[PDB]
Write an enzyme that holds these catalytic residues in place. Structure first.
Site, PDB file in Angstrom:
ATOM      1  N   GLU A 139      25.282  32.031  48.486  1.00 49.94           N
ATOM      2  CA  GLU A 139      26.054  32.724  47.457  1.00 49.94           C
ATOM      3  C   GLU A 139      25.614  34.185  47.514  1.00 49.94           C
ATOM      4  OE1 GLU A 139      24.914  31.707  43.476  1.00 49.94           O
ATOM      5  OE2 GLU A 139      26.963  32.041  42.663  1.00 49.94           O
ATOM      6  N   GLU A 241      30.687  39.072  35.837  1.00 47.18           N
ATOM      7  CA  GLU A 241      29.977  37.903  35.331  1.00 47.18           C
ATOM      8  C   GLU A 241      29.248  38.308  34.052  1.00 47.18           C
ATOM      9  OE1 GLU A 241      27.437  35.810  38.131  1.00 47.18           O
ATOM     10  OE2 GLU A 241      26.785  34.344  36.631  1.00 47.18           O
TER      11      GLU A 241
END
Length: 272
Positions: A139, A241
């Site tokens: 990721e 985020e």
């Protein structure tokens, strides 16, 4: 030796600051990538129903560089909204040549997105032949900005006390130093179920809200440090985020483009 693109279709991010209208909004978790009508891009939302109202609104194919969106969150639990390239076609990053993202956005202020938060570029890659099973899924984040928190100003770059892991090195690109961090996520949620995988971060030392990200330069520097991406890039998207808080993100520009080493355009969006 890599020539920066000078194609007229590239929108200067520094002055791309006109408020956009006519968004199309998504208020629930999308369940992965969802393609956008008349666009090369896809969006994804992760909106935990245990938290408050969140949304992502895409500004469409014909303004703001084609990938511009606004997102809002009201006491989420780790809201992620993201939009950009979706790949997942068994190709390493180098297949996509030099990837750039021009951007310009406004956002809510310090301490409006919880204890951790991220703004910038995000995705995953797969590397099944990696000898270390921990490193077969990746990721990744290129972090241009964040909201800071009670303890740290949003003008101060996040460190390993937010990301976890180890500082591997650093380099300078697009007007700032970036600290490069590797973290291992042990038996954690992923695109492949609960498992162990690695995270790569480049943290911009001088946070900003507009500019151009030379995304491929990060991928090259990671690989030089032994942070390999493998041979199946999943996606490359612009992300907001928010761990918590009540805030917003509102892009006047998100323009992805790809060019070869001569600087000629391979892909870009969108008479007098």
């Amino acid at each position: 030796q890599v020539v920066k693109p000078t194609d007229e279709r590239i929108i200067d991010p520094s002055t791309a600051n006109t408020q956009l209208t006519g968004g199309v909004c998504y208020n629930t978790t999308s369940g992965g990538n969802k393609p956008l009508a008349g666009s090369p891009y896809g969006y994804e939302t992760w909106i935990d129903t245990g938290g408050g109202v969140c949304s992502l609104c895409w500004y469409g194919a014909d303004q703001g560089g084609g990938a511009a969106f606004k997102a809002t969150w009201t006491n989420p639990h780790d809201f992620l909204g993201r939009l950009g390239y979706f790949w997942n076609e068994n190709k390493p990053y180098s297949h996509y040549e030099n990837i750039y993202c021009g951007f310009n956005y406004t956002r809510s202020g310090r301490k409006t997105a919880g204890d951790y938060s991220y703004i910038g570029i995000y995705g995953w890659s797969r590397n099944p032949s990696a000898s270390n099973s921990n490193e077969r899924l990746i990721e990744y984040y290129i972090v241009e900005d964040w909201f800071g928190n009670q303890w740290q100003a949003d003008t101060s770059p996040m460190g390993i006390n937010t990301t976890g892991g180890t500082v591997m090195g650093s380099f300078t690109v697009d007007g700032s130093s970036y600290q490069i961090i590797k973290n291992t996520r042990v038996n954690q949620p992923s695109i492949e179920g609960d498992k162990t995988f690695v995270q790569y971060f480049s943290i911009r030392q001088s946070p900003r809200k507009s500019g151009t990200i030379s995304i491929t330069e990060h991928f090259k520097k990671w690989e030089k440090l032994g942070m390999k991406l493998g041979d199946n890039m999943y996606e490359c998207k612009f992300l907001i985020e928010a761990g918590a808080g009540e805030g917003f993100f509102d892009a006047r520009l998100i323009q992805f483009y790809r060019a070869d080493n001569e600087g000629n355009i391979l892909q870009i969006t969108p008479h007098h």
